[PDB]
């Protein structure tokens, strides 16, 4: 049996495994194009999509983040009215982009008709497992029903199931299956790929279709984005570093002498509250971060300072030809800093 | 000497090294069939045994774990009939499913008929090293003396040890040697075999003999029973998951006001008190859990979740068809929450 | 060339990486033999010496560890008449297998002479590098000079370093550059073998002469003993496990309402008043173990539990025929226990 | 696509993955030849260079060093009059010598030209990615414009970066691109080479040259001074281990009942005031070392040690012939002092 033999063959790696080789270099940082074509009617002046998550991205997010030449997914833990109207204060904030999320439930048709008409931009259309028959059977039904919109499904985390999304007519297939820093989906079902290597095994066939993917969830720092990027993602999409933040949803705690915020998996259990199954995420706080421009600010920096370093002019280049190391824990160790008392906090480091 | 240059040619895995990888499903979650038969006289509802130790199953937590679908593994460490009480008082309960732990040992024989005269529908062999020669003949004698009783006995590690079980008329083999939380053989004796390796090994010789395997010790979290049994464990065995529930026999203390239970390992020196060799576990406590009830509910919610994601409408697709990805600890960082500071506690994540 | 190509092509294990391999067993335990010849004329009950540390080894350490079936190696930061005079000591309490350090000094042939005629039965010639040639020079004409008493030298971690000391007459190799626990060798120098690799690849020039090794350093649990003889040595020495004995030269001390003792490498700054160069390695304070015939019999306890496992009758069949195999600090986290908080100390594990 | 497919072909090695193997020895410790000639101009009695940054290196620490055998680089955080006059102070202290570095800006030239009036001895011209067409076309320039002064360009962590640099004249090529204690740029740009790797790649590049290297960043202790010299570095440089002397620029501060000093990346942003671009350093603060003579001397002695271990006679020894051993994170523990309360503070052990 081929299947019992190479029950162990695969082999994967996440951000904290490789580094970013450096290159011949004919481009300064601030010269870089940070641009991307999503899909013929979608480009974004920087490759950062906001969470579709009751924690992160509302239409005051959304704004905030189009602003900054990103894109914001409204979450759907709210009524088709409501997601629609949010919609509507986004694109009446200077006809700025905007994403809504969607599930596979019985109001889907319904809802993603109501964000059309609210002026939409993209449907994400999210579920826990994007790679399978009833999924996909809806997904084709709503791209037949909806032949203009700008389409992102998921999630998948192997190429026959961004294949098998693509196959239907997805413009953009979102691939990430238990890196999410809020997650549990990898300890309660022991299920999940690392998420550079979903990125690149994604790519390899959003290549082969002239499509795109979406590198959603694991992101720490501004040097994983990079890293997503060069391991083939066309974007990233952000919970963790975005959460905190002035323009996401809930407001600011003081928890001993400190501003926190709150930020919880749509698969906690508070979060499936507010729309059976066992929860996959957990609630959570993060430190207050302060506003969503002086994050981009931050994360675009590294951005700009990873591609100036491996000569990457665009983000097709970065995709396509900047080369990765492999590294053990022990170089992980040496990436941060280390054995030295850090004073005063960076604005790029926690 | 082919044994002098091969002393480290084999290697292990065990439950944080590898990852489900997600294929294409059919099957929802709550339309899983988690029944699996360990035996032609033996079927349970879910593949979940209790483990025979003094701190985890007495009659009253194989009647909750019986409710729930499983089984329970009466501990040794009483006499013989109290032993066989405890197993009238299970089949007294509406005729549940109830299993027995004996021992090699000069009461053997006599306990296992008196076990069989109270009704029990198997006996568990337990021993340290069931891959010994004395172990094998005592079996093989039980075997040809009780012809019709459902025999588990163990533990082995290596398929040349299940196959030598099996070889003597074993109906169900049980995997494990040093897994578990409350052991310390690995550390004493310098012997073992990582868990998820020694479960393939020995479930590659169960398929050969068309018997079945027990994957015993270990198990942190739901999503280790999926690798468990993916990895072609046909059931499992814990522990450590049950031990801190109301129907656990000890009675719950309060430290620093908080309620918690005692834990301890079967080879620990108080255990071995209340029935020479040097300990090979320790004694501990762990947080009160709940009930029986509630903990089941959440394990099973995460194997059908897993089984969602792998695609497996039953447990013969997960064994013969789901595959693996390895990764590193960086993957394992990755794949638990990180960056977070959790403020609620999830029902199935601590 | 081949020097700088073959740079990093030598890997290296260490005890946590590996486990022992159970195996079919006809040997229980208390049957096990634990007897050794390290030289024709020099044969232990027990495979341990300990170690020739002005911490570890005076003749109150060497008497007791005699009477457990092992050998004490009496240190020399001392005078020749009060090193000889603790050999003395020894051999009239029963005329007990005795054991002397000596160094590569101007005073070694005197020394020497001395505690022959004092009646040690080997002398232990204790370097940093024992694969030099100054060193090597000094041992042979020690051999020609005192041609009937059994000489341990050391300490090497090559073949070539080994074989360089057979050559010249050794009896006994010691085996280990930097896994001491007081050592910071590797962190001063660079320089260093992982401890199991040096004992198989000198074990495998000791077998080709006939002649034995001697597993010096980094043994942590009774496990590690085990492991350290299946990798080829005939016997080990111990430091870190025999500190904080009753026997052991220091005097107890209360910090912090607990007994401790003094613990310190020969190359600390400290040791080395007692008797330039750079230290390598460092002071400080272990708990209080209680007496030399508790902590033995409980290291013992572990070789004959490890032995039963693998099916080893004597020492042997365990460096002949045991297996190993290779696991990931995720199996070094599983093997020791995990997920439980540990109430009652046990005698053989911290 | 060949740059596709082999986007995770390439390992890394750091310090803590390796450990150089003993090796026969015919050379004590105290008789090993330190002295390296970086270029025919200049020859250092110790292989040691002091970082050009504004916590490390100033006239006084320039002096310091140079007494003690090796060469100080003053930092360029200053006007061209006040960098000139640091050297100026060198030189009057003896005729010692004396680097100095300058970055890639309009200013370049004039102030290379004032520190060579000055009598500097290396210009170190120092830049975050020194493999870009801007950098090496600036740098071919200055090398055309000032013929017979010594070069040090950096940094580069490959062989093509390091080929770019000597193609153009450099005589000395500075290497580690994310080493540093105080960096962050592996995390905010995800860029770097892990730095035993990345000084093997670049000496074998300057090998063919018949030029040098320096290795740069991430040295931790003197033992990791040994591992960068036989991976091929002809000297070392240091920030973290000079930090906190009484000859680095900063005055000690008291925190907690113990003395501190400041030690920041040049990147870091306070370090970017006192000389756009997102931060690559943190600000921290070191406990207080003592002289830098004292530092030094416990250096050296270990790199002696290291030289008696591998039977190098001199550092071209150690270059060309030393071999490593590869070990995991066990290795690495095993490899550090383990499973002891450190009592005393140890001068080459924190
Ligand atoms: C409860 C869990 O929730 C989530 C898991 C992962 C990511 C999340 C992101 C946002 C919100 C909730 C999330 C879940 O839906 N789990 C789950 C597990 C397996 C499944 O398998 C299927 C499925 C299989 C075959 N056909 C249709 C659906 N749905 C599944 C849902
Ligand atoms: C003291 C130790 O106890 C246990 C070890 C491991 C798992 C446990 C689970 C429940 C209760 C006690 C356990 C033990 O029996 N150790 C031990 C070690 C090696 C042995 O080897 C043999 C043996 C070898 C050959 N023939 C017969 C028996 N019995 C052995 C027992
Ligand atoms: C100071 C250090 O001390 C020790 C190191 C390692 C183990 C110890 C155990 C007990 C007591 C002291 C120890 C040492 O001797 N280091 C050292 C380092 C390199 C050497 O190289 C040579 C040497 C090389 C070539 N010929 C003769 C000697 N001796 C050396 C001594
Ligand atoms: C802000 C950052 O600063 C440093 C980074 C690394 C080491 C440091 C050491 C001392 C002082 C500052 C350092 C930087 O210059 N980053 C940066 C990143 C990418 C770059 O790419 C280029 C570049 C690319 C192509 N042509 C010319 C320059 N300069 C770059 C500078
Ligand atoms: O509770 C959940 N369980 C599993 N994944 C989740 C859950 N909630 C959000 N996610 C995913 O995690 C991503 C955010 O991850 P982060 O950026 O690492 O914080 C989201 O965009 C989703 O793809
Ligand atoms: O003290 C002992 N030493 C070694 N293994 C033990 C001991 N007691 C119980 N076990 C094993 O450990 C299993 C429980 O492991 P856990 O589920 O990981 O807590 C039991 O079912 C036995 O197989
Ligand atoms: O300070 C020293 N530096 C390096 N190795 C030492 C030093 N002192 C003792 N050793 C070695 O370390 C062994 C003890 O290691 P332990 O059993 O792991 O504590 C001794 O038998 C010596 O071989
Ligand atoms: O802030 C910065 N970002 C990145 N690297 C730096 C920065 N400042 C100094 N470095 C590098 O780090 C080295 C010192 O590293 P350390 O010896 O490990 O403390 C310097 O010689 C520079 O090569
Ligand atoms: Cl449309
Ligand atoms: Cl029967
Ligand atoms: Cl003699
Ligand atoms: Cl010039």
Known sequence: NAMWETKFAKE?????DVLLVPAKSDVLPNDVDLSVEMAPSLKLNVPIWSAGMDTITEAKMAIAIARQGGIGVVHKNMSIEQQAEEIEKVKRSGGLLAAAAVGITNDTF????????????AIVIDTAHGHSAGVINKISEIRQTFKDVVIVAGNVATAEGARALFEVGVDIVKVGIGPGSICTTRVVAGVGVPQITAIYDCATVAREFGKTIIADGGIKYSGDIVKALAAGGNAVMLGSMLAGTDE??????????????????MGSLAAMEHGKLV???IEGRVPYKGSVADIIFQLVGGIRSGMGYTGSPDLRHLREEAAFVRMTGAGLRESHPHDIQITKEAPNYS
């Open 248 to 265: 996401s949803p809930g407001e600011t705690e003081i928890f001993q002498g400190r501003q926190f915020k709150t930020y919880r998996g």
């Open 12 to 16: 994967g790696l996440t951000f904290d």
């Open 279 to 281: 929860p996959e995420g």
């Open 110 to 121: 319904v809802r993603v008709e109501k964000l059309i008409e609210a002026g939409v931009d």
